[PDB]
PDB file of C-alpha atoms and ligand atoms in Angstrom:
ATOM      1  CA  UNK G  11      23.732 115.021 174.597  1.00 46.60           C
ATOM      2  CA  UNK G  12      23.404 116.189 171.049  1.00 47.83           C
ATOM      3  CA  UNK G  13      26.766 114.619 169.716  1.00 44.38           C
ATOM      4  CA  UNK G  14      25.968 115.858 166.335  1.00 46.01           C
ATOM      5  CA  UNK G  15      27.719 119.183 167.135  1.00 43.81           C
ATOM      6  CA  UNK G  16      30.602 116.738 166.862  1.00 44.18           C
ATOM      7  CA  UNK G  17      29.533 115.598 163.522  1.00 43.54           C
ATOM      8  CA  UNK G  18      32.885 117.450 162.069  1.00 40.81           C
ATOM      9  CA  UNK G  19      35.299 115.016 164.772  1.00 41.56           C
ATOM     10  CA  UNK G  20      33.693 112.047 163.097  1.00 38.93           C
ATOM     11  CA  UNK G  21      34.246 113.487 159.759  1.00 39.05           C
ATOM     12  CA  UNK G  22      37.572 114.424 160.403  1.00 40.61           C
ATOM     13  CA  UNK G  23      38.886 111.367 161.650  1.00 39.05           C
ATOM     14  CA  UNK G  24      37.099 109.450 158.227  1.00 36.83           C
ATOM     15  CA  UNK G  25      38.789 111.541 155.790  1.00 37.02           C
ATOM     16  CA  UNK G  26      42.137 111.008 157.414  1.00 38.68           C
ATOM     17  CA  UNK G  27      41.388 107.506 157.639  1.00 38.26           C
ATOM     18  CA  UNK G  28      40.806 107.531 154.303  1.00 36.51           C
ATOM     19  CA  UNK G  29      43.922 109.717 152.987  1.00 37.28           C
ATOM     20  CA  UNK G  30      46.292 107.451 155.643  1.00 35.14           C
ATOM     21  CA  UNK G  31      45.802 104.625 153.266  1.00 34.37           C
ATOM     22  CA  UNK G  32      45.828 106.505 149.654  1.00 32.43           C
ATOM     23  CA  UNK G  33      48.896 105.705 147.139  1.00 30.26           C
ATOM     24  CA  UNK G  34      50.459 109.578 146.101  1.00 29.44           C
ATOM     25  CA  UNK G  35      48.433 108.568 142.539  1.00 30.35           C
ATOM     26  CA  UNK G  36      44.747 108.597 144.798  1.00 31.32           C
ATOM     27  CA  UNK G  37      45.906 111.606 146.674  1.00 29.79           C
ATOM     28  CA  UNK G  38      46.463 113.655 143.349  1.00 30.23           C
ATOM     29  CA  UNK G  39      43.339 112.620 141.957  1.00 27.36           C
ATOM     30  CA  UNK G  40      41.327 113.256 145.379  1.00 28.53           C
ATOM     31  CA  UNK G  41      42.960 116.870 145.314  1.00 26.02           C
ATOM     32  CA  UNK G  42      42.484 117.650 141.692  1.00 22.75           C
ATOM     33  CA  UNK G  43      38.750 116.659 142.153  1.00 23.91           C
ATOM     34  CA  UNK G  44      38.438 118.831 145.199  1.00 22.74           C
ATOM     35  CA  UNK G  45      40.102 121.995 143.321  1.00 23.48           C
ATOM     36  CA  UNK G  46      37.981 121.889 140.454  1.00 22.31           C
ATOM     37  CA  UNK G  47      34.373 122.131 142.761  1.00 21.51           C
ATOM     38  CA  UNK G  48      36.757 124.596 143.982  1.00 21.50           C
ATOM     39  CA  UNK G  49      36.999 126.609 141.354  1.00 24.49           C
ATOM     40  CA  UNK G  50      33.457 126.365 140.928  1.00 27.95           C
ATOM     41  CA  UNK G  51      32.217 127.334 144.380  1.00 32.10           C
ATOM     42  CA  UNK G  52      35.395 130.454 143.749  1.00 35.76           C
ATOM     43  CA  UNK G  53      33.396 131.625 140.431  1.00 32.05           C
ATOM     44  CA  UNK G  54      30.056 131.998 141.981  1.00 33.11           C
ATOM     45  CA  UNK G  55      31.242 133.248 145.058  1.00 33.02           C
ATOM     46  CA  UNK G  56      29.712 130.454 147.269  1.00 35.19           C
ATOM     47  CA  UNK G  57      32.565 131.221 150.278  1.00 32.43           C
ATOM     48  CA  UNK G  58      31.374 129.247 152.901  1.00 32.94           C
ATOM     49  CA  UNK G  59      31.858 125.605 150.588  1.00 32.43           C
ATOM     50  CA  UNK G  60      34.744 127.081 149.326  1.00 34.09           C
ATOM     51  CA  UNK G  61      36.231 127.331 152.586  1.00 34.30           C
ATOM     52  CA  UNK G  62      35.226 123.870 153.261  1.00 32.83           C
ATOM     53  CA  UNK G  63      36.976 122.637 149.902  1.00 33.15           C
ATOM     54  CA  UNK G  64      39.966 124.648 150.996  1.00 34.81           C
ATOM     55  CA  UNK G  65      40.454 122.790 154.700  1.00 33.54           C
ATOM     56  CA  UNK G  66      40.441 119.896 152.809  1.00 31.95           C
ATOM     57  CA  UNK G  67      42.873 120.354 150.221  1.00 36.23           C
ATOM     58  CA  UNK G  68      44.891 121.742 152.654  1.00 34.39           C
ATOM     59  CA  UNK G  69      44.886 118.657 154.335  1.00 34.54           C
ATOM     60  CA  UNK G  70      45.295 116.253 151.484  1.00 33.30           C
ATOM     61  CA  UNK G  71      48.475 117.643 150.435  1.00 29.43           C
ATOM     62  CA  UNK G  72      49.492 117.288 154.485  1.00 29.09           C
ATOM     63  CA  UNK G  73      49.351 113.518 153.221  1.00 31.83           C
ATOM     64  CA  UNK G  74      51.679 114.071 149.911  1.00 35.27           C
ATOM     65  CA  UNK G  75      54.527 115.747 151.868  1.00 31.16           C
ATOM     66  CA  UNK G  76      56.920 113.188 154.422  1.00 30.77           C
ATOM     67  CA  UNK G  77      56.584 114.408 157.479  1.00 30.07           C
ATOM     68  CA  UNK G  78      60.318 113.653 157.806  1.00 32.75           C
ATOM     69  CA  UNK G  79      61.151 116.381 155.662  1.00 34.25           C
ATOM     70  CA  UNK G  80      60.282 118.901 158.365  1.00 33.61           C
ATOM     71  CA  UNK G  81      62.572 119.204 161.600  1.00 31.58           C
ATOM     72  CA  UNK G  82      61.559 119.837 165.492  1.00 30.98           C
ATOM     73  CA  UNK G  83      63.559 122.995 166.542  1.00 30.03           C
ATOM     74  CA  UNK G  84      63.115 124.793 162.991  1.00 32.08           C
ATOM     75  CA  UNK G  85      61.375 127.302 162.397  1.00 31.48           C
ATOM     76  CA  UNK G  86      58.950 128.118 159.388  1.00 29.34           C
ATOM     77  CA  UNK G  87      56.844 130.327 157.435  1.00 26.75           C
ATOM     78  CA  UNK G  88      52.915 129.686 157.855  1.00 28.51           C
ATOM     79  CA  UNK G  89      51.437 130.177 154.119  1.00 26.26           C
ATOM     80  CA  UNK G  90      49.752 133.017 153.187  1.00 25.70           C
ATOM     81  CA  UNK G  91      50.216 134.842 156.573  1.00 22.29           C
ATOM     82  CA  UNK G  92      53.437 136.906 157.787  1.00 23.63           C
ATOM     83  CA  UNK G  93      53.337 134.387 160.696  1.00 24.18           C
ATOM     84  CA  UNK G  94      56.850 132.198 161.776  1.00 24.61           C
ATOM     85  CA  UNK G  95      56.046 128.847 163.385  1.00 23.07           C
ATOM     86  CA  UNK G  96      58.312 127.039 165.559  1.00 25.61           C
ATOM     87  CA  UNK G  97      57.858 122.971 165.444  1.00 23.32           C
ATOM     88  CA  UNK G  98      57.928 121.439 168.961  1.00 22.84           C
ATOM     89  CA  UNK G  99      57.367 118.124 167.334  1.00 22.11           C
ATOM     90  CA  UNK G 100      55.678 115.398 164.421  1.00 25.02           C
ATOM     91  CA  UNK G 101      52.730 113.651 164.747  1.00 22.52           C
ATOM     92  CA  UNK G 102      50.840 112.310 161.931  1.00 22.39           C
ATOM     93  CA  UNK G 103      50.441 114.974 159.400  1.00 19.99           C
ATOM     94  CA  UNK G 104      50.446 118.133 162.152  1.00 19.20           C
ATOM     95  CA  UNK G 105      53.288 119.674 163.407  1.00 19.74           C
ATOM     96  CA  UNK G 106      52.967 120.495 166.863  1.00 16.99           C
ATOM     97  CA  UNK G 107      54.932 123.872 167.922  1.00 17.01           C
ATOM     98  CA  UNK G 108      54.016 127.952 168.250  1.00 14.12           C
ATOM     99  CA  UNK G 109      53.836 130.894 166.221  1.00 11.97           C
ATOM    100  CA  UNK G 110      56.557 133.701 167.208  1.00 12.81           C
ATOM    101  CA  UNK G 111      53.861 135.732 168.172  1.00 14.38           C
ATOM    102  CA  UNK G 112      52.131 133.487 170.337  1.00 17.37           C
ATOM    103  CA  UNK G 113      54.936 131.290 171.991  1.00 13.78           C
ATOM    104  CA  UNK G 114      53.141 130.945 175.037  1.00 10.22           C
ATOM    105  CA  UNK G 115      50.543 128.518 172.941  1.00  9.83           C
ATOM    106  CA  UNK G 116      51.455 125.242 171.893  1.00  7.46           C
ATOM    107  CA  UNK G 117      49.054 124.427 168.497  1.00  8.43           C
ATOM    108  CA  UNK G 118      48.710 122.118 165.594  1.00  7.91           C
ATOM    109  CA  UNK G 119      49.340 122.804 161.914  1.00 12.17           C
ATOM    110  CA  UNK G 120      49.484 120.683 158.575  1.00 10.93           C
ATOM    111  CA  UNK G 121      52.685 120.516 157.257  1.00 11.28           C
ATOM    112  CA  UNK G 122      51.258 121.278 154.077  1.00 11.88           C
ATOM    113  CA  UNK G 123      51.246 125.181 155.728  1.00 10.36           C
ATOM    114  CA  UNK G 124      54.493 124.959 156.436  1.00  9.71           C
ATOM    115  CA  UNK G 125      57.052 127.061 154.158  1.00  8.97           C
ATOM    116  CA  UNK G 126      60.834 127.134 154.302  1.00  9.11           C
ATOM    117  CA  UNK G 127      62.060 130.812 155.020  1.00 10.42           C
ATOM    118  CA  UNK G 128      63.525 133.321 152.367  1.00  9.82           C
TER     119      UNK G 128
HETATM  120 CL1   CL Q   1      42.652 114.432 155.068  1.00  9.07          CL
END
């Protein structure tokens, strides 16, 4: 068994470990440190890390929003795609629900994706 391939799960669960227990001050300064290597990997057109950096902003700003702020039954925008998702329920940082165009398929987004319609 070559759990590495799991390496990711392991890193995963650290880094939310990690944000779980950050004051909104740490979380600003984690993110603001993550956008500027950002911006670097953006300028040299290393896509792969900037990706990575991306996921992970993505996430720490999960951690900035209250997860209270965002209601089971309604239904939202997903960022940067013409997608509507439908939350089934809160847990953590994810909201658990479907897109419109997938309802048969119960998934897991940040909140942090989650936009109020216009
Ligand atoms: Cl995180």
């Amino acid at each position: 068994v070559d759990l590495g391939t799991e390496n990711l799960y392991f890193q995963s669960n650290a880094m939310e470990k990690r944000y779980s227990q950050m004051t909104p001050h740490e979380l600003n300064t984690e993110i603001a440190l993550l956008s500027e290597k950002a911006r670097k990997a953006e300028q040299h057109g290393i896509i792969n890390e900037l990706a990575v950096l991306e996921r992970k902003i993505t996430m720490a700003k999960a951690y900035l929003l209250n997860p209270e702020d965002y209601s089971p039954g309604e239904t939202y925008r997903v960022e940067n795609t013409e997608d509507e998702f439908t939350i089934s329920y809160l847990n953590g940082v994810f909201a658990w629900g479907y897109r419109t165009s997938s309802p048969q398929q119960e998934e897991a987004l940040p909140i942090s994706v989650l936009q109020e319609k216009e």
